[PDB]
């Protein structure tokens, strides 16, 4: 149940659905460039997103085959299997929601091994099926092996624009285990040769990036061996390896697996095995962001725009969080009576900052204003706002995703920065029709500059997101407004 093999020469054959474009090389049976039509290259583009490629600058192939004692794809059995296909073009059928590919291969002895890619239409999991026909007169010991294999860096095209983020989506190996229901593996850590080796009973292995995923989900009732390898000269692996199993003379066998080569969709990776969901990079904010991405998703189930969606989302979040504003608007409220008193006890204390504090502290204290003043809302928007920002990086159904007008892609920067600054308009409006509770001209000088230092923040950063606390404080305007 021991080796996996390296890429050979074959002939390659195309396997077309609605929605995956493939490549497979007949010696092996590997996928060696995968395409997603429903999914383009980028927005105002005719080219689809190409996940897997096999490249002179960049590889990222999904390999498998039957390894172990007699396994044809075993190294030590002599070369990969050549398999032999009727016809090198293979296309979903109108009306047909199933599209079959078998390859035959026939070993000096009589031993024939099938393996078969059976897809379905709107699927992204295709299924790899092994049958193994025992001519011999002493069992046969098949393993069956997929591997994921991957240039560790990224073709130039990686990066752009200053980086736009502070942290990048994370781009590398993963895996699950019913003891580890999902941990993530650095291709750096691959590249140093310190490799993977546990036993999971069922999992996957997986290799992702920003939205999409390679996944080999096997299927048997043994215990896998899932492994990293370090193949060298840049070059990172992922995989599996199956339990032996037996295949008397005169008997036939059925090896099966499966494979992911999509979008990071989560209710549709859920079903096709355990875990497989939590693929999706939402940060340190998981607990928040996907909760969030639900509800969301069920709101555009009824406006089916994301956009609204997010009009919609903020204003639900204005509610449930109502009762913290309000209780801040209380605070400062009593922040500003207080005002004479604290100039009054600076100017009878004099130059003692740390009586002036405690005095100020207590009688804080005493009628309960928060200490942090203006800039605790600042603080609780914090995990709201990188809960947002993983929830938009991270969706693939938001990339790409129009509002209106203008925007054309919730999860892309305004191309126009527009939206940024109209914004920063609204704090302006904000700060000038409130109070702002100046007492040091100090922090007030920062204050006034607050719109534009605010507005370049924003303009970096997703559409979706800048929309989200546009109407977010236009929440807060209309609520003085109508007070007022």
Excluded at 10 to 26: C, E, F, H, W
Excluded at 50 to 68: D, H, K, N, R, V
Excluded at 86 to 100: F, T
Excluded at 226 to 243: C, E, H, P, R
Aim: charged share 15%; aromatic share 12%; proline share 7%.
């Amino acid at each position: 149940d021991q080796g996996v093999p390296a890429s050979g020469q074959g002939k390659l054959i195309s396997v077309k659905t609605d929605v995956l474009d493939l490549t497979i090389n007949t010696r092996g049976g590997d996928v060696e460039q995968a395409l997603l039509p429903a999914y383009p290259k980028e927005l105002n583009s005719t080219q689809p997103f190409q996940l897997l490629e096999t490249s002179p600058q960049f590889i990222y192939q999904a390999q498998s085959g039957l390894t172990g004692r007699d396994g044809p794809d075993n190294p030590a059995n002599g070369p990969r299997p050549l398999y032999n296909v009727e016809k090198d073009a293979y296309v979903l059928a109108e009306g047909q929601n199933e599209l079959q590919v078998p390859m035959t291969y026939t070993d000096a002895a009589g031993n024939t091994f099938t393996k078969t890619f059976v897809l379905k239409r709107g699927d992204y999991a295709v299924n790899v099926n092994y049958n193994v026909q025992n001519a011999g007169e002493k069992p046969l010991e098949i393993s069956t092996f997929g591997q994921l294999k991957q240039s560790i860096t990224l073709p130039p095209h990686l990066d752009t624009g200053s980086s736009n983020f502070a942290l990048h989506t994370f781009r590398g190996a993963a895996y699950s285990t019913p003891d580890e229901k999902y941990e993530k593996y650095k291709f750096d850590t691959i590249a140093d040769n310190e490799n993977l080796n546990i036993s999971s009973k069922g999992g996957w292995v997986a290799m992702l990036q920003q939205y999409f995923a390679t996944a080999w989900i096997p299927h048997n009732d043994g215990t896998n061996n899932f492994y990293t390898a370090n193949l060298g000269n840049g070059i990172a692996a992922i995989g599996y390896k199956s339990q032996p199993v037996l295949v008397q003379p005169g008997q036939t066998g059925a090896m099966n697996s499966t494979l992911w080569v999509g979008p990071e969709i989560q209710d549709k990776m859920a079903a096709v095995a355990p875990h497989l969901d939590l693929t999706v990079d939402y940060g340190w904010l998981w607990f928040i962001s996907q909760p969030l991405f639900k509800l969301l998703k069920w709101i555009h189930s009824f406006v089916g725009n994301w956009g609204f969606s997010i009009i919609i989302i903020t204003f639900i979040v204005r509610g449930i969080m109502y009762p913290l504003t309000k209780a801040q608007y209380t605070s400062m409220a009593k922040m500003r009576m207080l005002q004479p008193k604290i100039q009054a006890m600076r100017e009878r204390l004099g130059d003692d900052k740390q009586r002036i504090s405690q005095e100020m502290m207590a009688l804080y204290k005493a009628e309960k204003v928060n200490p942090l003043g203006g800039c605790f809302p600042l603080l609780i928007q914090m995990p709201i706002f990188l809960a947002l920002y993983y929830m938009l990086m991270g969706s693939v159904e938001l990339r790409q995703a129009p509002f209106a007008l203008w925007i054309h892609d919730l999860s892309a920067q305004d191309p126009y920065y527009i939206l940024p600054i109209l914004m920063g308009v609204t704090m302006f409006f904000i700060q000038k029709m409130s109070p702002t509770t100046v007492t040091d001209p100090m922090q007030q000088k920062i204050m006034t500059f607050m719109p534009v230092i605010f507005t370049v923040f924003f303009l970096w950063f997703p559409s979706g997101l800048v929309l989200y606390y546009i109407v977010s404080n236009l929440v807060t305007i209309i609520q003085q407004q109508l007070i007022y």
